[PDB]
Amino acid sequence: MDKNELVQKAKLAEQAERYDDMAACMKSVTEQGAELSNEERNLLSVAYKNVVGARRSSWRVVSSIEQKTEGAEKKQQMAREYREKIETELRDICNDVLSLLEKFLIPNASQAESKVFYLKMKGDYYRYLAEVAAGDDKKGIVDQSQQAYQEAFEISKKEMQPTHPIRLGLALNFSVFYYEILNSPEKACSLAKTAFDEAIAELDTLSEESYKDSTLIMQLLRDNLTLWTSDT
Amino acid sequence: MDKNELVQKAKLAEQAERYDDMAACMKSVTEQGAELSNEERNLLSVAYKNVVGARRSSWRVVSSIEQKEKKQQMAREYREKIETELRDICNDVLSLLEKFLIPNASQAESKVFYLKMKGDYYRYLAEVAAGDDKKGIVDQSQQAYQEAFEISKKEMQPTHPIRLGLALNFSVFYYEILNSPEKACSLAKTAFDEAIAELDTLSEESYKDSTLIMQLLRDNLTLWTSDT
Amino acid sequence: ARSHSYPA
Amino acid sequence: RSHSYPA
Helix, strand or coil, X not given: CCHHHHHHHHHXXXXXXXXXXXXXXXHHHHCCCCCCCHHXXXXXXXXXXXXXXXXXXXXXXXXXXXXXXXXXXXXXXXXXXXXXXXXXXXXXXXXXXXXXXXXXHHHHCCCHHHHHHHHHHHHHHHHHHXXXXXXXXXXXXXXXXXXXXXXXXXXXXXXXXXXXXXXXXXHHHHHHHXXXXXXXXXXXXXXXXXXXXXXXXXXXXXXXXXXXHHHHHHHHHHHHHXXXXXXX | CCHHHHHHHHHHHHHCCCHHHHHHHHHHHHHCCCCCCHHHHHHHHHHHHHHHHHHHHHHHHHHHHHCCCCCCHHHHHHHHHHHHHHHHHHHHHHHHHHHHHCCCCCCHHHHHHHHHHHHHHHHHHHHHCCCCCCCCCHHHHXXXXXXXXXXXXXXXXXXXXHHHHHHHHHHHHHHHXXXXXXXXXXXXXXXXXXXXXXXXXXXXXXXXXXXXXXXXXXXXXXXXCCCC | CXXXXXXX | XXXXXXC
């Protein structure tokens, strides 16, 4: 239908916490083929993060149970099969968004901000596929994640100020990629630490619009360093 | 899968917070037609409550948006769609109750549990029933709760969790559906006071649930006896 | 506030 | 668990 309608209904879906309705609405908007506005790209992002987020969370709960029922045959096999069912939904959700990104979002970006946003998103959804990828931990979807993040990383570093929330957010997520998917804590800490130290040197550049987002992400970077440096 | 397997899967679904799957498993256990255990009754109840509860919460939000000229039809249309989902879940549970659970509930505790559930799901229908607020389906709710109440006072101690939970929700029904604050407070107070006079009769397995419902009765009493 | 009922 | 953004 019309795009101001679909968006209206996405926002209503969002208020009702009906994230599949919100997702379907924004998928339809993006399939119309026009560059999303900022508001539209933020709604699309929230909707899918919530849909995939429910599956990632269920998957972690069921994986933990599977681990803890080692030696308890009937329980562990049921946990196994349930985890596999959840994985298939998660992979379908990710493939959905990665197809949206490849067909519409990336090809129409046109501003560096938006290009960095969507490559980050492609790295993120491949990172979610990597979390469950066949080999029970990682697999060749790891390179797609890394390469989308690297290209985002180079653009953001050339086109954006260090306190920009999209640049800070990508550094945060790319460092989580190094730490969790590539099992490389030193590189993860170095990337997070550089992003934090470079933004903090330019507190000046914080804007009235982005103050809150930037500041939150800067704290997330510092908390990851605290977590990943746990020793003393 | 087989029955014991459906129950294990239902508990897994609960831990994963996948309440649709949880209800689907308990539904299939029910349709096999054998009387449910205590554990299987609780699982059925918790699964449907979460499933219907998501529609109830969504309907409140969209209902309210809608009542607070050009856009507005949209909110109305969305509210109706959510309403149909709600009504479908309540009819699903009501049909399971009328076709399998009540007819062969052979023990008093089961009959009271199922009649309370029948009460609850008619109450959820009455919250949305044509007029935007309450039709003669309220009578189906009242009838079920009333029979459950009389059976529970006759066969169960005042601290039993099922007798207590039923008094709590019957109390809510008097307050919210029948619009009678004094009958709701009187029902809740009498339930709390009779239970607190016999704390002595509480078992190790039910003491936590009984005591939790007792506080819920007390919170409603404070809430319905509040001041603006 | 919403009245409390059980199960929640 | 490592924090990422949006959360």
